[PDB]
Amino acid sequence: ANIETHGMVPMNRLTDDPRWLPAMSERVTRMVQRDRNHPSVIIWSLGNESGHGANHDALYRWIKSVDPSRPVQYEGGGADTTATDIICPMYARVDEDQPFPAVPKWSIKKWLSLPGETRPLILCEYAHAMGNSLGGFAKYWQAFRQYPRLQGGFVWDWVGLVFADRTPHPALT
Amino acid sequence: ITDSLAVVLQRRDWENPGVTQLNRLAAHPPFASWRNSEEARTDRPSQQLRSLNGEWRFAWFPAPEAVPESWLECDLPEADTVVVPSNWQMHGYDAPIYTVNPPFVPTENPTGCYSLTFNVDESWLQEGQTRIIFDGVNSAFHLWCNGRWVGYGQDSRLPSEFDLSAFLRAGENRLAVMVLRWSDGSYLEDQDMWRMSGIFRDVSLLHKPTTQISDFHVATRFNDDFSRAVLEAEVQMCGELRDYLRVTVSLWQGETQVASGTAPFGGEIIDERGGYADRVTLRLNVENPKLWSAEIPNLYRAVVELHTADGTLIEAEACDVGFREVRIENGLLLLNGKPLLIRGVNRHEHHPLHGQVMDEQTMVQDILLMKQNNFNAVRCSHYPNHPLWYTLCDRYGLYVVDEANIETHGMVPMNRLTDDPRWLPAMSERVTRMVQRDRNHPSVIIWSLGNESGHGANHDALYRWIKSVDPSRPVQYEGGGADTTATDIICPMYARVDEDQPFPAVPKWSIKKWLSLPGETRPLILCEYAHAMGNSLGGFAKYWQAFRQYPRLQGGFVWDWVGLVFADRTPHPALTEAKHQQQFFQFRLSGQTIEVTSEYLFRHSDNELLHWMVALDGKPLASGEVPLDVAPQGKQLIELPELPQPESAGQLWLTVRVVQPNATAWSEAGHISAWQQWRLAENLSVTLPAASHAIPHLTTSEMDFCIELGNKRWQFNRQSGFLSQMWIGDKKQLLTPLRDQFTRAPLDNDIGVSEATRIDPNAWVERWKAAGHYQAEAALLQCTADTLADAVLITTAHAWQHQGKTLFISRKTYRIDGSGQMAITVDVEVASDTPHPARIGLNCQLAQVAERVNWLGLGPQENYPDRLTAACFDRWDLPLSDMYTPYVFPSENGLRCGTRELNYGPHQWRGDFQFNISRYSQQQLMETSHRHLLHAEEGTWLNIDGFHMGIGGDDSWSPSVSAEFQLSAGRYHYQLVWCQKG
């Protein structure tokens, strides 16, 4: 869904405000009504980098009621809130923890085994490919193979892994 | 008659799994039968409990049928005298054994016939019940009293009690105990230790009144914040029920009573037919109770008095009560609301010189040593322990896992008996009688169903029995994959931190992966890990890094306390590594600020002092002491003063240590509990050496190169290509030429289970032998000598070939300058297809024997690439004897890593190397079976390695050296400087 408010100073200033719920509901509902018939679409996403507000929980439950055939994921508020069926951290590391206040980025191996955690983990963003990059990519895929509940991820910026003229980067190999 | 041996032994009760006892009394907590409340409160000795330990008569027989009938009446003429708490194998009768027909035992069953003549006062026989308690008898036994058969028993590790009232006569009496070595119970006690047999625990006589306390157990309930507690005690009596009988339970903290309760008999309504007339439950309210933990073992004294309504006491029983709550919440094992981190060790009952007989002094010595090494938990390794062990763990503070005596690892399906309902009665007795005995001890926090018996339906049934009877403790069981339905805790044996071991039907996942398997929510505590056999415990820091990071990884139990110490309780070098990794204070350095985090859950750091020191290459520069004021799990930030900034070359090292100024019950004043070291600042050396005016002189012959400088002189063998001799004055310095070494005397981890019969091709030592590393012969490729403007240059190249295959190539450079110094640069190529060598360095036999070894490097104790975290960089001076570790089976030992300078006699070696120095060569260590056969050689053997392979430790039967500690680079370089006192 076309919801992205990363510039807000609390970052949930609008997604926790009920006055913005009508605006955000239109962006979620009209997407589902348009694309619900496509077999390729297997997961709904509530947006990107908008904190976690009560509007996210309400819109998460709307999708589950209208279309129970697809899981709903959302990074925001720590990537493991009640508004996501999948733990989907951004740029979580394989072994090193990043305990930021109120939104820690645990290592993906440790994140799975936290007390009470049963959901699968798929990284919505990992392996930043800006410039000469993608070092340690083999570390992620060693972990993906070994751990059943580590079910892959999405490399950031296809185009990126290729130039604008679609010429490939060395990291694409 | 029917008391005769022929009748008694005819039914073969020791070959019947359905008969485990005959005429044995019910299990219960320990009883002393005090006739005075004050004596019970203060735990004074009771005159109603009499010990029969002492001198008994003993006779040995090859089989039970060989015992003559006359033994039942009179002591044999050839019977000798022994101290009854002993194993008869320790007296040399049949050979002790360290190592099938499931119900049957061999007909050649050695039999020990014990007999004792004792006196009984008439006061015991006129009134009351007199019983005899056998705390431990190995396998099975038959009991006679004055020639009359009494009963039969099994389950060596739990007390057997029999009523002797109808058998005792006023005056002199005689007891006859027929102990058999093997019974059907031996199939459930088929573990791996010295087998041994006899009456290995205490024998005592207890006199109880006609109306007596038959059983009692206590339960503690708490509110949300543990500010209010309820102590419920259920008391059961035996004998005649009278309406004037009363039971009083009083709780004492020291000498002040804090709670009390009195009630007549008659319990609450249980079901339709009513309630127990012989039971009463007393509820005692305690405000702000002092909680029990391993850190602070706060104990109360509960006194249970059976008395008349008027006020006359009949009998008194007492026990120590600790207030604590153990439960698993959200996949975490909590004690008093806090997540436990188990610093545990497995401990067998092994006396230093009396075999399996345990005494109080050895137990207190073991507990003190454990707590001084930051251990907080002990696993009762595969059987219930001596009763006094649990009392001592309550008082000093140690979490205890109590294990049922069930062990059937020798069965081919390994669950052949535990899945057989015909063996359920046998196994139930071993579980139920343990719980009935030890359920009142606060130190016991976890029940264990046994060890290495597969997983059968009997395990599930016995697991649910414990949960019903005692819901206050979790139940754990390894077996059937360590995560079955019969365990509340995933308790794998020797699971690795990162590497998975997917065995069929019982995989050993890595502990990190095991936690996150689909549907898995339980905590993980390793019942056995870090095998400490020989030179071992490599990679121990890997486990404790994982323990800290993952909340549901709550520690484990290191295998074999005694092991981590020798039989005489002398510590192994690996014990220091365990103490450092198990510290309760963690340290972080950021600039001039030291962050100290407390790992205690309950206590405040009120006996703690931080001493910091800054040294430059072992030379102290500044020091200071700061008191520690850290809340449980809190952080204290300690800002160091302006640290010294020397302009001399070298590395600055900051060392902190936690010192306890006051003595505790388990430690003496000045005890060091934690330490840490850092590198502060290094000034690289840029100064040139002094312009020596002299030049070493080179002479060339067809057999050798000779370099002469003053009184010193070097000789290089041109045929061998190695430095053969060095002379200071006219005194030779070497007995063996300085040559490259690529092998080490194999460790126990290097050997594995590779016997001479069942070879293990995957073992490290077998791969080295198959590759010819021990048989490779050095071949000289080139050897040249050139005179420089100020030095003499020697260049050599050797190839180590085995059966037409080059394993290693060594290119060495010798630079003898005019100052007398000798610089040695070594470049080594290792073939990629050969197994990685155990070491890359040099060795020689020095002619001189010296008393002290002085080196600037890591640790006073021996350390290895994967067991060096506990070691510290400083200047160490030790006698040569302390440079050798006396392992029972000789192997490579005594290595010191991270060494920059080594001094021995007049010789100094500088560089970046590891070394071991001793009087035994690596060749002798490989060929000598036991350390008592080791003999010192003529000189001193020195091994200087640029690189050394890590030691194993995850297990002892499979390769366990991690990839980052294997010598797999392929090409290696190191430099050494050899100088003298000039």
Which chain B residues have a beta carbon less than 8 Å from that of A113? Answer: 512, 515-516, 550-552
For the sheet with B697-700, list strands across it.
B697-700, B704-709, B712-717, B723-728, B731-732
Residues of chain A in contact with residue B510, where contact means CB-CB under 8 angstroms, are 146
Q: In chain A, count H helices and then E strands.
A: 4, 4
Contact A110 B549 (CB under 8 A): yes
The CA distance from B638 to B630, in Å, is 11
Amino acid B338 reads K
Distance CA B769, CA B746 (A): 11
Are B868 and B858 a contacting pair, CB within 8 Å? yes
Judge contact between B778 and B800, C-beta under 8 A.
yes
Cα distance between residue B910 and residue B963, in whole Å:
29
Question: Which residue type does B487 have?
Answer: T
Closest CA to B458 of B470, B449, B469: B449
Whether the CB of A113 is below 8 Å from some CB of chain B: the reply is yes
Identify any residues that bridge with B279 across adjacent strands, giving them in sequence order: B236
C-alpha span between A111 and A115 (Å, rounded) = 9
Amino acid of residue B570 = T
Q: Which of A107, A115, A149 lies at the smallest CB-CB distance from B551?
A: A115
Active site residue B452: yes
Cα separation of B489 and B553, whole Å? 11
C-alpha dihedral sign at B768, B771, B777, B781:
negative
CB distance B518–A113 less than 8 Å?
no
B residues 530..549 contacting A (CB < 8 A): 549
How many residues are present in chain B?
982
- Indicate left, alpha or beta for A134 from its phi (over 0: left) and psi (-120 to 50: alpha): left
To 5 degrees, how large is the angle CA B457–CA B409–CA B566?
A: 135
Q: Return d(Cα B542, Cα A104) in angstroms, integer.
A: 24
Lookup: tokens for B579: 């103490």
* Residue B902 bridge partners (DSSP): B855, B909
CB B512 to CB A114 under 8 A?
A: no
Contact present, B828 and B840 (Cβ < 8 Å): yes
- Experimental method of this PDB entry: cryo-EM
Residues paired with B611 in a beta bridge:
B625, B657
Cα(B254)–Cα(B266) distance, rounded to whole angstroms? 31
Separation CA B936–CA B921 (nearest Å):
9
Put simply, whether B517 touches A (Cβ < 8 Å) is yes
Count of all residues that appear for chain A in the document: 173
Check if B599 is active-site.
Answer: no
Q: What is the rounded distance in angstroms from the CA atom of residue A156 to the CA atom of residue A130? A: 9
Q: What burial class does residue B418 get, using C-beta atoms within 10 Å of its C-beta: 0-12 exposed, 13-18 middle, 19+ buried?
A: buried
Widest distance between CA atoms in chain A: 48
Q: Please give, rounded to a whole number of angstroms, the shortest distance from the CA of A47 to a CA of chain B.
A: 28
Q: Please name the member of A109, A110, A148 whose beta carbon is closest to the beta carbon of B518.
A: A148
Whether the CB-CB separation of B538 and B864 falls below 8 Å is answered with yes
Closest CA of chain A from B514, distance in Å: 9
DSSP B939: S
**Residue from B338, B516, B550 to probe the interface with A (highest A Cβ count within 10 Å):** B516
Q: What angle do CA B676, B681, B683 make, to 5 degrees?
A: 140
Min Cα separation B473/chain A (Å): 20
CA distances for B496 relative to B314, B499, B553, B754, angstroms: 57, 6, 12, 21
**Active-site residue numbers of A?**
49, 125
Alpha-carbon distance A90 to A79, whole Å? 8
Resolution for this PDB entry, in angstroms: 2.2
A36 part of contact set with chain B, CB < 8 Å? no
Q: Please list, in sequence order, all residues whose beta carbon lies within 8 angstroms of the beta carbon of residue B927, skipping any fewer than 6 positions away.
A: none
Q: Is B703 exposed, middle or buried (0-12, 13-18, 19+ CB in 10 A)?
A: exposed
Of B458, B437, B459, nearest in space to B448 by CA: B459
* Side-chain-side CA neighbours of residue B531 (13 Å): 21
**Which two structure tokens, joined as six digits, stand for B752?**
């594995």
Instruction: Please tell me the distance from the alpha carbon of residue A8 to that of residue A3, in angstroms, as a whole number.
Output: 13
Count Cβ atoms within 10 A of the Cβ of residue B782 and give its class: 0-12 exposed, 13-18 middle, 19 or more buried. exposed
Distance CA B450, CA B487 (A): 11
Element (H, E) at A123: strand A121-126
Instruction: Say how many C-beta atoms besides its own lie within 10 A of residue B209's C-beta.
Output: 17
**B36: closest CA among B275, B305, B279, B220?**
B305
Scanning chain A, the segments in alpha helix (DSSP H) are: 21-35, 54-66, 108-112, 137-146
| Binding site feature residues of A for substrate | 49, 125-128
Residue with tokens 């989907």, as numbered in its chain: A88
H/E run at residue A150: strand A150-155
State yes or no: B409 annotated in a binding site.
yes
B501 CA: distance to closest CA in chain A (Å):
12
Report in angstroms the alpha-carbon separations of B471 from B403, B740, B834.
16, 64, 57
The answer to whether residues B945 and B958 touch, using CB atoms and an 8 Å cutoff, is: no
Interior CA angle at A170 toward A167 and A173, to 5°? 100
B531 labelled binding-site residue: yes
Q: Which of A109, A115, A146 sits opposite B552 (nearest CB)?
A: A115
Token pair of B455, please?
Answer: 């997983």
d(CA B199, CA B570): 28
Residue of B676, B602, B607, B594 lying closest to B635 (CA atoms): B594
* Radius of gyration (C-alpha) of chain A in whole angstroms: 17
Helix, strand or coil, per DSSP, at residue B665: coil
